[PDB]
From a paper:
(but not from Homo sapiens [H.s.]) we obtained diffracting crystals that allowed a structure determination at a resolution of 1.6 Å. The structure revealed a β sandwich formed by two antiparallel four-stranded β sheets, a fold characteristic of C2 domains. In our structure of C2B from Oreochromis niloticus, the equivalent residues (V195 and A200) point inward toward its hydrophobic core, suggesting that they play a structurally analogous role in stabilizing the C2B fold. Prime candidates for interaction interfaces in these domains are the regions defined by strands 3 and 4 at the edges of their β sandwich that constitute their most conserved parts. Strikingly, other structurally characterized C2 domains engage their binding partners using exactly the same interface.
Using X-ray crystallography, we show that the ciliopathy-associated centriolar protein CEP120 contains three C2 domains. All three C2 domains of CEP120 (C2A, C2B, and C2C) adopt the PLC δ1-like topology II and are structurally similar to each other (root-mean-square deviation [RMSD], 2.4–2.6 Å), with major differences found mainly in their loop length.
Residue numbers in the entry: 166 to 346
């Protein structure tokens, strides 16, 4: 059988592994912290000034559709750092194995029903460093590049440096009783 995160609807947590053996509570969280150079993902300066331009981040976390607080200033992002968390009932070994087997988290920058770009954040990398969950939280954090869904990326003017659209993301796994700190 495949390891699956099974929503327990009444209680508001996901069971991973057999419920009689995997009984500890964990929190898995995603924080979108800041962004820069997002204007490269919009082909026209004119769309930046339309007020229908309202942008947000989307991702699926263990099957949960998550959207962030909409913001308007793409050139100078104004959104607040925002965390989404899910509760998991599991065991340390089974949850670490489950996470090591998950595909990367794909975080999208959206406008309306359009994805302007996405970036991959490895949950398996987080599992790989989740080696002291009895005592410490484990966190992968960095500046992740947002890639447009186009075949060809055009850059005008072409410079020696290449500042790309970037999203600061932190993904954290911890025992529920272990403070993020």
């Amino acid at each position: 059988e495949k390891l699956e995160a099974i929503l327990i609807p009444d209680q508001g947590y996901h069971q991973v592994g057999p419920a009689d053996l995997c009984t500890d509570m964990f929190v898995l969280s995603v924080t979108v912290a800041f962004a820069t150079k997002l204007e490269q993902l919009v082909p026209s300066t004119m769309k930046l000034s339309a007020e229908g331009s309202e942008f947000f981040f989307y991702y699926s976390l263990l099957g949960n559709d998550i959207t962030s607080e909409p913001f308007h200033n793409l050139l100078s992002p104004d959104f607040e750092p925002e965390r989404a968390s899910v509760r998991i009932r599991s065991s340390k070994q089974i949850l670490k194995a489950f996470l090591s087997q998950q595909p990367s988290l794909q975080i999208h920058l959206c406008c309306g029903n359009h994805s302007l770009g996405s970036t991959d954040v490895s949950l398996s990398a987080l599992a790989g460093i989740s080696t002291d969950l009895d005592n410490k939280a484990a966190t992968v954090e960095g500046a992740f590049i947002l890639q447009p869904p186009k075949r060809v990326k055009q850059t005008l003017p072409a410079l020696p440096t290449d500042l790309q659209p970037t999203l600061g993301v932190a993904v954290t796994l911890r025992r529920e009783e272990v403070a993020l700190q």
